[PDB]
Each structure stands twice: as structure tokens, then as C-alpha cells.
Nucleic acid binder design. Structure first.
Ligand code: ZN
Length: 462
RNA sequence: GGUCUCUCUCGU
RNA sequence: ACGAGAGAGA
């Protein structure tokens, strides 16, 4: 991805989009009980903590584009994935507006507790003023679709969250691109059925882990990804995508039977316009973080990417012997013979992709089930039933979460949630957690889940 | 102050 | 089953 131009909102006619500049995050009653190295992200140009110009680090993620036009490797890769998806029998027909707005069995309704985007967010119009879960009223929507149209600009905000200290000094906060409700609606009407399919089939056919539950999914993966694991991280995946990958995606949608009218929506995300404060800017390439389809489209593209990298880097790759699962840029993949990711990354560069070793090390060492992680969790065989696999969220990350809070009103729910993540690390580790929580007055007032009950309830999932 | 997923809680 | 909240992940 690359910024093409920046223009004053005066020159473009766009309304100013201003977001909050102070964090909702405050130290919690456990801040000093547990160790951590994360603080609230920088939200403001003159955060005392800054060591670089803020807006320059913010947008530094747009590293540029290399390829615009799929070569033969990318074409073949897009095709292998497309034929694999055909067995899913995706409904390529347009989903009704009612379903797209208000939900189906396999697609959650448009979030109503969340902004309605450009231009409503400036006009003081919220989603609730247009949509109604009880009515399933589609009439006011179909009016605003024809008042403001489609292809409205993304409203850019800085994401309020914890970031490592390195990331706070270096102004490396994350942006989110608020979608216009109009595009969300239209993207959902066009691809809603493909969302449904993907949500109901996490696994190695979709190649996607969207819709998976780690408590039960982790036991399938060593069976879904047989052979030798390989994995790696991307730096700045979304923003690093060159337009070629959106061309590639158009190939996949076309092949599985999408109409040329529907395939044409992809350029709509490859080429996008954003409002940040008082300026308008145009981005070519890069997935816009906050549009409808972000997870699934990123996951689909990864499926294309891993394939193309394999057959351009190595001789005699059989793509039918590749098994992989993606969740956006997160990947776990397997092949009958070990894959050398040092070489994939070299190829990755030629495609404008920045790939680094999985273990966060600077060498591409071996990846195995003992040290693989996916969605931040590891894989730990149960000591009693080894075919069942614990997803192990590191206590380090759990300690990070518990030290802060956006509203201490909800300390109970927060701590319980963390305990449902933490027990998988084992009885000894969990009780060390719990007793540390008890070591403090608010702690002795919380209801904490019993280890053996957590384990008992986990075993009955099977 | 986005898109989604999963899980928990609280109500009728 | 439906409403409201939260946490985590991408
Ligand atoms: Zn443009």
C-alpha cells in the first residue's frame, strides 16, 4: 500500500473527522500486583512519551507497492485456491438487505453499538437512528443508500489499546478505518453468503480459522496440518499489500462464480480514500482495516500468498500437499517436507511482503507443535488425554491485560474472562494466578472459576 | 473511537 | 429464544 496524495478537506469537500485524544485506560487494582511492559498507545501529537513525529510513524506502515499485475505464480496460486473452494458450494447470489443488515444463523447483525461512519458520524446520526433489530426495518436504510451512495471515505481513528514500550516511544499506534454503513451494507449484500460459508467452515478447505473456537479447534489442527509445520510473521501485513493481491483476489471470486458486477467491488477496497482530522488522503493497495470482509478477505489473500511463494521459491512443489489455516495475516501451514522460510521471505520481499521468524527471533528456526503459536496461543497436549490439545495463552499476555481497565465497574467479568484463558497453562500456573489476584482487597471480592470445573467443562466439549 | 470471530456475564 | 454488558484474538 502507498499513499497517493494528501489534500485539505477544504479542497475535497469532506467533513472533518476528529476522534478522542485521551485514553480510557487507567491502571487497575492489579497494576502493581503483576509485572508488565505495556502502556496505553499514543493518541496525541504531543504525548510526552513520544520520541519521533507522531503522524509520520502512524502512516509509515504504507511501505509502497511493488507488483500491480499478477505474474504466472500468483495466477496459478489464485487458481489452486479457487478450485479448492468450489467444494464448499458458496452461494454467489446477492443476499437480501434485511439479512445483510440484521443477520442470519451464520452472520452476526451489523453492530449497532458502533459508529455509522462517514458522513453520519459528523451529522450526529447513529446506526440506531436507521436500523432496528426488532422492526427489521430496511426502508430507512434503502433511503440513505440513495442519499449518500456507495464508496464513501473511510474515517481514520487511532486505536485505544495497550502497546509495548518500544511501540509507544516510536509512535507506532494502530489506525482503524471506520467504514461507512453504506459500504458495510453493500459489501454484506454482495458477499454475505461467502461470509456465512467461511464462518461455518473454519479449517483447511476455506483455509481460514475465522469462526473457530480455540478450545475445540486446537485439537483438530495437528490432524488438519499433518507433516512439517512452517510459519512466520508479517510486519504490517494489511498496509503492505500491493494491488497485485487484489487482482489475485478478483481471480478467485471470478472463478468460483461471482458476477463481474460483484468482482468489481474489490477495486473499491484496493483503491480507497480516507479522512484523518482535517485532511483527505488516497491509498492504493493495502487492505483497509475496518471494512466489511476484512478478516475473510485478508485470510483469502494469505491463502493466495502462501501458494505463490511456495511455487516461486521451490522446484517441484505439490500444492495439493499443502495444508494451511489463516486468520488474516496469522498463519499455520504444513507440507510433507520441511519448508525453509528464510527463502520464502526473500521471495516475499519481491512481492513487497516483510516476513520475519515465528519465534520473534532473528533466525528462521524450526517450527514444531511444541513452539508454534496461532492467535497468540500455543499447543499443549493434555497430560491425561494427549489427543486433546490445550490452547495456551501465555501468562505474560494475561498479566498485561489485567493491569489496566477502561471501566473498573466490570472488574469481575474481566478477571473471569482472563481465568478462562489462563487455566490451560496448568493447575500450578493457574493457582499462582488466582492467589496473586487474592493478594489484594478487590481480589477477595471477585468470583473466580474453580480449576477442576473449568477442566471438567472443557472435557465435556468433546 | 471500524470490521469480524470466539468465549464469558447479566437480564426477560 | 431475545435483549444488555465485557474480555480476548485477527
Ligand atoms: Zn484515490
Amino acid at each position: 500500500g502507498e499513499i497517493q496524495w494528501v489534500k485539505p478537506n477544504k479542497e475535497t469537500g469532506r467533513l472533518n473527522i476528529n476522534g478522542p485524544t485521551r485514553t480510557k485506560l487507567e491502571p487497575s487494582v492489579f497494576h502493581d500486583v503483576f509485572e508488565g511492559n505495556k502502556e496505553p498507545a499514543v493518541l496525541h501529537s504531543k504525548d510526552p512519551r513520544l520520541e519521533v513525529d507522531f503522524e509520520q510513524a502512524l502512516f509509515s506502515k504504507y511501505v509502497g507497492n511493488t507488483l500491480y499485475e499478477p505474474d504466472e505464480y500468483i495466477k496459478e496460486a489464485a487458481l489452486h485456491y479457487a478450485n479448492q473452494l468450489k467444494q464448499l458450494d458458496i452461494d454467489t447470489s446477492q443476499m437480501s438487505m434485511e439479512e445483510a443488515c440484521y443477520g442470519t444463523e451464520n452472520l452476526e447483525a451489523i453492530d449497532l453499538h458502533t459508529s455509522a461512519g462517514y458522513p453520519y458520524s459528523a451529522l450526529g446520526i447513529k446506526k440506531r437512528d436507521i436500523l432496528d433489530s426488532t422492526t427489521r426495518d430496511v426502508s430507512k436504510m434503502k433511503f440513505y443508500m440513495d442519499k449518500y451512495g456507495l464508496d464513501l471515505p473511510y474515517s481514520t481513528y487511532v486505536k485505544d489499546e495497550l502497546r509495548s514500550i518500544d511501540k509507544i516511544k516510536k509512535g507506532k499506534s494502530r489506525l482503524i478505518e471506520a467504514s461507512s454503513l453504506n459500504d458495510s451494507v453493500y459489501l454484506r449484500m454482495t458477499f454475505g453468503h461467502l461470509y456465512e460459508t467461511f464462518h461455518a467452515n473454519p479449517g483447511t478447505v476455506t483455509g481460514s480459522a475465522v469462526g473457530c473456537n480455540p478450545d475445540t479447534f486446537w485439537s483438530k489442527l495437528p490432524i488438519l496440518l499433518p507433516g512439517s509445520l512452517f510459519a512466520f510473521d508479517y510486519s504490517g501485513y494489511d498496509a503492505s499489500l500491493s494491488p497485485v493481491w487484489f487482482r489475485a483476489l478478483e481471480l478467485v471470486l471470478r472463478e468460483i462464480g461471482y458476477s463481474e458486477e460483484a468482482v468489481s467491488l474489490v477495486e473499491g477496497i484496493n483503491h480507497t480514500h480516507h479522512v484523518y482530522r482535517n485532511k483527505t488522503y488516497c491509498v492504493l493497495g493495502g487492505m483497509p482495516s475496518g471494512c466489511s470482509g476484512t478478516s475473510i478477505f485478508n485470510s483469502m489473500i494469505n491463502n493466495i500468498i502462501i501458494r505463490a511463494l511456495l511455487i516461486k521459491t521451490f522446484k517441484g512443489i505439490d500444492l495439493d500437499e499443502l495444508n494451511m489455516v489463516a486468520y488474516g495475516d496469522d498463519v499455520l501451514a504444513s507440507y510433507p517436507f520441511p519448508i525453509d522460510c528464510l527463502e520464502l521471505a526473500r521471495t516475499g520481499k519481491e512481492y513487497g511482503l516483510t516476513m520475519t521468524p515465528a519465534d520473534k527471533s532473528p533466525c528462521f528456526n524450526e517450527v514444531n507443535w511444541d513452539n508454534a503459536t496461532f492467535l497468540k496461543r500455543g499447543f499443549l497436549p493434555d497430560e491425561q488425554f494427549p489427543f486433546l490439545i490445550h490452547p495456551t495463552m501465555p501468562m505474560k499476555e494475561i498479566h498485561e491485560s489485567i493491569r489496566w481497565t477502561k471501566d473498573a465497574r466490570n472488574t469481575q467479568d474481566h478477571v473471569r474472562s482472563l481465568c478462562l484463558l489462563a487455566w490451560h497453562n496448568g493447575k500450578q500456573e493457574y493457582e499462582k494466578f488466582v492467589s496473586a489476584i487474592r493478594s489484594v482487597p478487590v481480589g477477595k471480592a471477585l468470583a473466580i472459576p474453580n480449576y477442576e470445573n473449568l477442566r471438567r467443562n472443557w472435557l465435556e466439549l468433546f
